[PDB]
Write an enzyme that holds these catalytic residues in place. Structure first.
Site, short mmCIF file in Angstrom:
data_model
loop_
_atom_site.label_atom_id
_atom_site.label_comp_id
_atom_site.label_asym_id
_atom_site.label_seq_id
_atom_site.Cartn_x
_atom_site.Cartn_y
_atom_site.Cartn_z
N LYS A 102 4.32 7.27 -5.99
CA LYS A 102 2.96 6.91 -5.62
C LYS A 102 2.84 6.55 -4.15
O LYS A 102 1.79 6.80 -3.54
CB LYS A 102 2.45 5.73 -6.45
CG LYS A 102 2.76 5.78 -7.90
CD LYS A 102 2.29 4.50 -8.57
CE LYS A 102 2.99 3.30 -8.00
NZ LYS A 102 4.32 3.13 -8.62
N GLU A 135 3.22 -4.88 -1.78
CA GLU A 135 4.35 -3.97 -1.86
C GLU A 135 5.44 -4.41 -0.89
O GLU A 135 5.44 -5.54 -0.40
CB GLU A 135 3.93 -2.54 -1.58
CG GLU A 135 3.11 -1.94 -2.67
CD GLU A 135 3.93 -1.36 -3.82
OE1 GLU A 135 3.75 -0.15 -4.10
OE2 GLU A 135 4.70 -2.08 -4.49
N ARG A 136 6.40 -3.53 -0.63
CA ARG A 136 7.52 -3.88 0.21
C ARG A 136 7.09 -3.96 1.67
O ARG A 136 6.24 -3.21 2.13
CB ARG A 136 8.62 -2.84 0.07
CG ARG A 136 9.05 -2.61 -1.34
CD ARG A 136 9.66 -1.25 -1.44
NE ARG A 136 10.36 -1.06 -2.69
CZ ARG A 136 9.80 -0.64 -3.80
NH1 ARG A 136 8.51 -0.37 -3.84
NH2 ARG A 136 10.53 -0.50 -4.89
#
Ligand SMILES: Nc1ncnc2c1ncn2[C@@H]1O[C@H](COP(=O)(O)OP(=O)(O)OP(=O)(O)O)[C@@H](O)[C@H]1O
Ligand SMILES: Nc1ncnc2c1ncn2[C@@H]1O[C@H](COP(=O)(O)OP(=O)(O)OP(=O)(O)O)[C@@H](O)[C@H]1O
Ligand SMILES: Nc1ncnc2c1ncn2[C@@H]1O[C@H](COP(=O)(O)OP(=O)(O)O)[C@@H](O)[C@H]1O
Ligand SMILES: [Mg+2]
Ligand SMILES: [Mg+2]
Ligand SMILES: [Mg+2]
Lengths: 435, 520, 113, 383, 52
Positions: free
Chosen positions: A154, A180-181
């Protein structure tokens, strides 16, 4: 006037106001904390106490520490002055290019526009991806979701969308990195310096992208409101400047997850699988703001993490109804090596009406879904016996559908750094004819 | 009747008798001459039990501040309630009584970081347990440090060689990434991680000072028998002069096993922040969350899925996001995390496994059915991912891994048709044996990591078909025949050139022809 | 410290208050003095609605409740025990606990004779 | 603590008065000097005791009925759901961010009403009846309760007239009678709305061919949907002509969870006007599985005891007292009818889930729509 | 489901070998001879390596 901290349980602070409590959603500034600690009032507890979620960490909070009400919700810089900058959840620059110019200072909390200012105009968004443009075409002005578990692609698919759609686009873009990261937020930043999307220094106004980051290290107060901050930057371009905005939200699952990390400490008895009772209403109140009104347009692309490939989980299952085109990415397709791992018989678009994309596109899309569902129905035999008991009537529909599964695969421009093959952008007229 | 309004007392507190004692005992006329217990920087224990002391007073204590009991045992002020403090205890609560004094230390939780920790075995709070005295050349840094932001980082380009052939080829790991080792019990999770630490000793003697990797092994919830086996192993190899061992074992308090990954990371963040390279291995991050669940259920924080707290994701994301490759303005150092999550019957849909799978970049998934097929390390090649990918692979290994990743992809789909050796096809049978040369190529004995140049030659020997003549059952002896019979200068110039040059892939083409392979 | 031990042990948090109130008044030999004053407040909560507003109404602020009870009880020959007692119950909003503090004060006085 | 020792304190026992006669002469100056530090005490009014997540606990409100509309001083409406011994737990029809601790709550004395009648036909109202199509207030309309008791055994007759959906898979295989509850169950994106849309569009094509008493007046209740999805449905019903006979009750996803709970009952009261007046109604509760999540949210925040999948114990009673209002009345009650079409979204076909099991028990049959038949070319995908 | 007669010869060699080592890992215990009758067998370590 001021309030004092009475209780600190993790990321949840109770503040006591002797007279004149703040409203719910109001922003509070803790006086004397080392970093700028901002609390947002979640509820009125009942004995002149409000309960808050902290936008940063609470280690170092003392009971009795003074808390200043701001009389308003979290207010972020909006306008042209934020393009090419990286913003915090509380609108602070974390890009080290100095303070942010302010066309206005907007609250991140808003109501969804109304029923009366809704734009009922379905027009296609040519992506450049074969499996997307054929079987689930995206709407120019609508809400797009990329569902998938961990490691199906994704983030790569939203990176291919950023340089295939937002690169050649007249309006501006906002990327709201929601939980997220932090590494791939630095990857996205340096990709856009070298591609010229974000221009540093004195060319800053020529940038066409605002980044709002609320990544995984941050507390659940920050990750729950950073989607609202990234939406406010796009709602200023839609309302005040009246233009077509793009909003890429990476992992809208983290918005619901960060609300779930505090909600038991907010005094709420738990719902189903671990989520808060207010799961559909927290998620609903955010997504109804990402709409094309009559003023401007927000074409949103939302990656949705699907926990353990389980689309029946309530955090991916609630956000299906908020979308115009769902791009379900599958682990089964990626085990064949086919990338992008878009499930062809699980991706759906509202644009697949033949009244909208025409019947010549509609029949090659429905025909590909017909021949791929038939092959799925025939793998009950030809993965047990071996393609010899079909008398060449539907031996041919296997070898038609097996060529179709590989033809839906496509090299990406952003996957050049992964795999040694050049990127391919396909026109919509070419992918109808090829399929 | 108006008296029935006051029928049942409506209490807005629980320790009300501790407040009315502070006003009724100085009303005694003998007892106004400072016969009073203090509340600002001191505290009285109300309740003890299960390693949770509830402390009255400590009005100026900070959230997450280290406190000390008068018995000597330390604690961490974790819940700051309106009328008491919930203090988790860093030892045994047998020495804490009701009415004991609790002194705040003024300090959020610290550990000794520095170069004086290298070689030492410490507990989860920094005290050394190896019996070699205090830590000398160290300073006390915080334990909960914010992870470095977007500007503080750069892309993960340089690799981190493990020595495991199935991960230096298939699942390549760069300096600065987070690679989860997830698997069932006794499937090779520690052994993969131990081989990564042992290999750095074999590579630290061949690189300059700015290229060395300093390992940190965090052992959470294991036995002291297992940790003493590792320190015996890391001393016998010589890896202890680069290794820190942070050991919060199973007999330690649940706050010590909760903090040992963070206390171990703060020691490993010394090397990241000073331009050197670190490698932290959080062995059983599944056992940290069990210790965090216990510590949170006793503090009466309401449970969620599998009785875990709500913030068990933020427990693991704020730990794992500290493994970063820093930018050149910040010294350029890196920290590489290897969290280890144990699954139950391969169920990776469990709550803590799904959290860390979504946090980390890659995952090394090991199976218990591949482990008993002789495939050791038991790496499931389909489910294993590395999201840095071949951007941080050894070149040369990257040239041969594409032939290895593709043929093992076809070897897996040709399987579940391989039970019919009567049914020859000679096209599937071509790859049913070619992938099986590759499968038994990737097998490797433990506690012997291989240099990366000897691995990419052994994958070259099976992707180009040099080992097609040998049977499937004797490739592990043939890989010894490839290595021990070629000229050992082929490895010397492959390590220096960094890729299989055109002046080398015809040198080592004929070099793998003047070897004798055990198959004929 | 060194307070005289109660005639019989009792239940929690409202009998705990009365046991402490008993042990303080026995250290001061006012066991009938503050017993009668507790009875005096029960009829006093019966007389006025503005005084039981300070024990049931959850919108009366703490500053109003502690200032009223102190400014009313500044004098009148009430004990220093019951003056400090009512400041303690009005600090915490436990003024409604007085009606069942005193029945635990009763059976401590009954078991003292 | 005990009672027999505490009931003897109503009698005076003081027998000394150095306190009772003093402070009674000294109470009223101390109380009056903080008069501006006081709020006036509420008895039949309410004061907001605490508020959060759309739930306001309200001190006072001595005379509120259970289920009564209360109004805050912000103008936001409420609904007194659980009256407890010390407070009223009200659910807030809107944002609770404009509701503060200490706000005044006023009872309206009305159990929740909606405008029903001939003037609501063709309009798009919200989940409480107020029009959101932006063409003025509802005229030629009258108020009625949303918690009408369903007709009994003796006010019903046998369901014999066919109601035509216009779908060959429905009208041949699973045929619908005129006062019937038929579930449209299935996974997401399988064509559950499209079955219900075509049943509404077909009523417009039939209403111009029947003699004015066989006319069916449709009600589409959109619960928990997007506002852009309901804007498409308004465009589809206007460009067809179906919104001469269609009402649209729309409680979308950003709406308050009491409004999404209340929107099926508000649409059924608008649909019961046609059943009670001898005409025929047809009601589609699209995402009845999104009403139940909204009712679960209000219940868990009101601290009601959870059951399986954390639903309240009365979530069967929620859907059964809604769906039993779809009836075929006897000829002495006019002979009118109301036929329901609840829409349940399953998760991977699991119809053993808790809300899907409840509504399968209530209704008179399902329309299943499998997603494997959907991609096999069978559209409508009626299993 | 398919039966013994459908495997390869390489498979049904190991099916017969694993059915042999499944029975060979079993052993009469000396404490179980009171209710099974079969006397127990202390197998030496060299006897079970070379036996297997
Ligand atoms: N590559 C290998 N070759 C041979 N034996 C191996 C290999 N890797 C691991 N083993 C052995 O397999 C067993 C598995 O233990 P390992 O050290 O892998 O721990 P684990 O299974 O990850 O953890 P736990 O002890 O919690 O189950 C050990 O006896 C180990 O020595
Ligand atoms: N009979 C049909 N023929 C062709 N296409 C159809 C048919 N029915 C539905 N579709 C298409 O399938 C898609 C899903 O239909 P619909 O929206 O009615 O399903 P749904 O069950 O309401 O899904 P959701 O509940 O997620 O909104 C629609 O985009 C529609 O265009
Ligand atoms: N289009 C693609 N081509 C090749 N590999 C891909 C593609 N998309 C994803 N992958 C592989 O899958 C992994 C998933 O990456 P990412 O998108 O970050 O996962 P997620 O979607 O879970 O965030 C990538 O590291 C890459 O190795
Ligand atoms: Mg991602
Ligand atoms: Mg282990
Ligand atoms: Mg629908």
């Amino acid at each position: 006037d001021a309030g004092y901290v009475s209780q600190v349980i993790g990321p949840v602070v109770d503040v006591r106001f002797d007279g004149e409590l703040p409203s719910i959603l109001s922003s509070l500034e803790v006086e004397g904390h080392s970093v700028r600690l901002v609390l947002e009032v979640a509820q009125h507890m009942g004995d002149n106490t409000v309960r808050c979620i902290a936008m940063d960490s609470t280690d170092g909070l003392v009971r009795g520490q003074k808390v200043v009400d701001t009389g308003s919700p979290i207010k972020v810089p909006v306008g042209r002055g934020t393009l090419g900058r990286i913003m915090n959840v509380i609108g602070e620059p974390v890009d080290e290019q100095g303070p942010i110019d302010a066309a206005d200072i907007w609250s991140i909390h808003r109501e969804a526009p109304e029923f009366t200012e809704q734009s009922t105009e379905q027009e296609i968004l040519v992506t450049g991806i074969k499996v997307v443009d054929l079987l689930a075409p995206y709407q120019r002005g609508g809400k797009i979701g990329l569902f998938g578990g961990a490691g199906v692609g994704k983030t790569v698919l939203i990176m291919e969308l950023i340089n295939n759609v937002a690169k050649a686009h007249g309006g501006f873009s906002v990327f709201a990195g929601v939980g997220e990261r932090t590494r791939e937020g630095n990857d996205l930043y340096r990709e856009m310096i070298e591609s010229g999307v974000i221009k540093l220094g004195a060319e800053r106004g020529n940038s066409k992208c605002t980044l709002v980051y609320g990544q995984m290290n941050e507390p659940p107060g920050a990750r729950a409101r950073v989607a609202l901050t990234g939406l406010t930057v796009a709602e200023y371009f839609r309302d005040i400047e009246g233009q077509d905005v793009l909003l890429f939200v990476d992992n809208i699952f983290r918005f619901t997850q960060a609300n779930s990390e505090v909600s038991a400490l907010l005094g709420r008895i738990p719902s189903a699988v671990g989520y808060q009772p207010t799961l559909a209403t927290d998620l609903g109140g955010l997504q109804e703001r990402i709409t094309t009104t009559t003023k401007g347009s927000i074409t949103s692309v939302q990656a949705v993490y699907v926990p353990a490939d389980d689309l029946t989980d309530p955090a991916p299952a609630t956000t299906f109804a908020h979308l115009d085109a769902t791009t379900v990415l599958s682990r089964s397709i990626a085990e064949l090596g086919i990338y992008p791992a878009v499930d062809p018989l699980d991706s759906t678009s509202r644009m697949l009406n033949p009244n909208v994309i025409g019947a010549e596109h509609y029949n090659v899309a429905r025909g590909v879904q017909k021949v791929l569902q038939d092959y799925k129905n025939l793998q009950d035999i030809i993965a047990i016996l071996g393609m010899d008991e079909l008398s060449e009537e539907d031996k041919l529909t296997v070898a038609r559908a097996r060529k179709i599964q590989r033809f839906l695969s496509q090299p990406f421009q952003v996957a050049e750094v992964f795999t040694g093959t050049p990127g391919k952008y396909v026109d919509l007229a070419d992918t109808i004819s090829g399929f | 009747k108006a008296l029935d309004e006051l029928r049942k007392p409506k209490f807005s507190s629980k320790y009300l008798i501790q407040h009315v004692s502070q006003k009724l005992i100085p009303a005694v006329k003998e007892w106004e001459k400072s016969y009073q217990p203090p509340v600002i920087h001191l505290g009285r224990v109300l309740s003890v039990g299960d390693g949770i002391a509830r402390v009255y007073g400590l009005k100026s204590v900070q959230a997450g501040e280290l406190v000390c009991f008068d018995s000597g045992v330390k604690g961490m002020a974790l819940n700051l309630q309106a009328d008491h403090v919930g203090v988790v205890v860093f030892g045994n609560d047998s020495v804490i009584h009701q009415g004991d004094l609790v002194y705040r230390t003024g300090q959020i939780v610290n550990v000794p970081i520095g170069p004086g920790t290298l070689g030492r075995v410490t507990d989860g709070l920094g005290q050394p347990i190896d019996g070699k005295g205090p830590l000398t050349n160290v300073r006390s840094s915080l334990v909960e440090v914010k992870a470095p932001g977007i500007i503080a980082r750069q892309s993960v380009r340089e690799p981190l060689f493990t020595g495991v052939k199935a991960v230096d080829a298939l699942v390549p790991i760069g300096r600065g990434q987070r690679e989860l080792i997830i698997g069932d019990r006794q499937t090779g999770k520690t052994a993969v991680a131990i081989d990564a630490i042992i290999h750095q000793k074999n590579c630290n003697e061949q690189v300059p000072k700015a290229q060395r990797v300093y390992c940190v092994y965090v052992a959470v919830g294991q036995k002291r028998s297992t940790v003493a086996q590792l320190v015996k192993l890391f001393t016998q190899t010589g890896a202890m002069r680069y290794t820190i061992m942070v050991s919060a074992t199973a007999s330690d308090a649940a706050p010590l096993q909760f903090l040992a990954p963070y206390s171990g990371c703060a020691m490993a963040e010394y090397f990241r922040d000073t331009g050197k390279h670190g490698l932290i291995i959080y062995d059983d991050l599944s056992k940290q969350s069990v210790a965090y669940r216990q510590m949170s259920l006793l503090l009466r924080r309401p449970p969620g899925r599998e009785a875990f707290p709500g913030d068990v994701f933020y427990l693991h994301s704020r730990l794992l996001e500290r493994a970063a490759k820093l930018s050149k303005e910040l010294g350029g150092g890196s920290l590489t995390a290897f969290p280890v999550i144990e699954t139950q019957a391969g169920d990776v849909s469990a709550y803590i496994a799904t959290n860390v799978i979504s946090i980390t970049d890659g995952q090394i998934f090991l199976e218990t059915e591949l482990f008993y097929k002789g495939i050791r390390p038991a790496l499931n090649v389909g489910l294993s991912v590395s999201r840095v990918g071949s951007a941080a692979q050894f070149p040369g290994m990257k040239q041969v891994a594409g032939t290895l990743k593709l043929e093992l992809a076809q070897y897996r789909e040709v399987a579940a048709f391989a039970q019919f050796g009567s049914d020859l096809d000679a096209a599937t049978q071509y790859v049913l044996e070619r992938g099986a040369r590759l499968t038994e190529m990737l097998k490797q004995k433990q506690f012997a990591p291989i240099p990366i140049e000897r691995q990419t030659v052994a994958v070259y020997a099976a992707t180009k078909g040099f080992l097609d003549k040998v049977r499937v059952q004797d490739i592990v002896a043939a890989e010894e025949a490839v290595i021990s019979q070629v000229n050992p200068a082929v490895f010397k110039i492959l390590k220096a050139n960094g890729k299989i040059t055109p002046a080398l892939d015809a040198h080592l083409k004929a070099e793998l022809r003047k070897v004798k392979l055990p198959g004929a | 410290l060194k307070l005289p031990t109660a005639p019989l042990q009792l239940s929690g948090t409202s009998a705990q208050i009365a046991t402490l109130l008993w042990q303080v008044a026995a250290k001061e030999n006012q066991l009938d003095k503050v017993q009668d004053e507790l009875y005096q407040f029960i009829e006093l909560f019966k007389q006025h609605s503005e005084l039981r507003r300070l024990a049931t109404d959850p919108f009366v602020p703490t500053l109003v409740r502690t200032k009223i009870i102190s400014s009313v009880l500044k004098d009148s020959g009430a004990s220093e025990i019951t003056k400090k007692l009512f400041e303690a119950l009005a600090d915490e909003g436990a003024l409604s606990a007085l009606l069942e503090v005193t029945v635990n004060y009763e059976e401590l006085m009954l078991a003292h004779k | 603590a005990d009672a027999k020792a505490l009931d003897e304190l109503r009698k005076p026992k003081f027998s000394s008065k150095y306190l009772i006669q003093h402070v009674s002469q000294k109470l009223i100056p101390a109380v009056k000097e903080w008069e501006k530090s006081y709020q006036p005490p509420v008895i039949h009014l309410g004061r907001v005791l605490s508020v959060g997540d759309g739930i306001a606990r309200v001190y006072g409100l001595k005379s509120v009925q259970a289920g009564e509309l209360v109004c805050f001083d912000s103008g936001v409406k409420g609904m007194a759901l659980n009256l407890q011994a010390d407070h009223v737990g009200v659910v807030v029809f809107g944002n609770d961010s404009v509701i503060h601790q200490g706000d005044l709550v006023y009872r309206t004395g009305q159990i929740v009403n909606v405008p029903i009648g001939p003037g609501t036909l063709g309009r798009v109202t919200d989940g409480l009846g107020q029009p959101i199509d932006g063409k003025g207030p509802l005229t030629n309309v009258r108020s009625s309760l949303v918690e009408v008791k369903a007709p009994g055994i003796i006010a019903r007759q046998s369901v014999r007239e066919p109601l035509f959906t216009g779908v060959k898979a429905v009208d041949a295989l699973v045929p619908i009678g005129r006062g019937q509850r038929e579930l449209i169950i299935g996974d997401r994106q399988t064509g559950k709305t499209a079955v219900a849309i075509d049943a509404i569009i077909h009523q417009k094509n039939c209403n111009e061919q029947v003699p004015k008493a066989q006319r069916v007046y449709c009600v589409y209740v959109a619960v928990g949907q997007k506002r852009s999805t309901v804007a498409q449905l308004v465009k589809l019903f206007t460009q067809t002509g179906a919104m001469r006979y269609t009402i649209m009750v729309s409680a979308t996803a950003s709406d308050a969870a009491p409004l999404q709970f209340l929107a099926p009952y508000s649409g059924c009261a608008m649909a019961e006007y046609f059943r009670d007046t001898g005409k025929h109604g047809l009601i589609i509760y699209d995402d009845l599985s999104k009403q139940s999540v909204a009712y679960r949210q209000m219940s868990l925040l009101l601290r009601r005891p959870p059951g399986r999948e954390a639903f309240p114990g009365d979530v069967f009673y929620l859907h059964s007292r809604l769906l039993e209002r779809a009836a075929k009345l006897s000829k002495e009650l006019g002979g009118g009818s109301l036929t329901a079409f609840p829409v349940i979204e399953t998760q991977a076909g699991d119809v053993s889930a808790y809300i899907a099991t409840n509504v399968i028990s209530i209704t008179d049959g399902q329309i299943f729509l499998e997603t494997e038949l959907f991609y096999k070319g069978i559209r409508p995908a009626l299993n």
